[PDB]
């Protein structure tokens, strides 16, 4: 459908005019939505769109040739996670809404095109999320989720939020 | 873009 664009001017400029020009902005527009560095958002992806790609924007940059990209730090859904959703006393204490709902940070990164950005959502903290619940705006929590710790892909494991791990 | 891309 339509674009996304970015918002006024260049935060930052990196190397000589031309094939080697990088031109860094803080945010993108679509009509009235903005997402900015440091958002977190859904990305399009192909099939199974119960678990939707979602990850923290780090920079935005064009280059040469009109290529809009952003880097990316993505998320895991617990099922994604190695250990599975069979893996998932900690089991005692997690909410009911667990699988639905928590994302496991993690320090994979990639650079995508911004037009594959589908819409802004919120990953917060455990206790931010469950007071957000008791609003009436954040009731039905759409695009909000909480964060269940660290995922390490490279190895498998995970970790809680308080860096113990699991 | 069509759809996003991860790498591993």
């Given at each position: ?48 769109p119960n678990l939707p ?12 040739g009109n290529n809009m ?86 190895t498998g494991m995970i ?8 | ?8």
């Amino acid at each position: 459908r339509q674009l996304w664009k970015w918002f006024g001017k260049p935060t930052q400029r990196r190397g000589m005019k031309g094939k080697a020009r990088k031109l860094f902005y803080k945010a993108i527009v679509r009509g009235k939505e903005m997402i900015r560095i440091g958002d977190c958002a859904v990305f399009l992806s192909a099939g199974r769109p119960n678990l939707p790609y979602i990850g923290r924007i780090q920079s935005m940059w064009e280059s040469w040739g009109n290529n809009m990209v952003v880097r990316v730090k993505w998320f895991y859904h617990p099922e994604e996670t190695s250990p599975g959703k069979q893996f998932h006393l900690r089991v005692s204490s997690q909410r009911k809404d667990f699988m639905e709902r928590a994302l496991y940070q993690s320090s994979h990164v990639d650079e995508n095109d911004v037009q594959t950005v589908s819409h802004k959502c919120l990953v917060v903290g455990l206790e931010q999320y469950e007071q957000m619940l008791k609003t009436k705006k954040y009731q039905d929590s759409e695009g909000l989720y909480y964060l269940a710790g660290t995922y390490e892909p490279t190895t498998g494991m995970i970790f809680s939020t308080d860096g113990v791990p699991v | 873009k069509q759809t996003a891309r991860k790498s591993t």
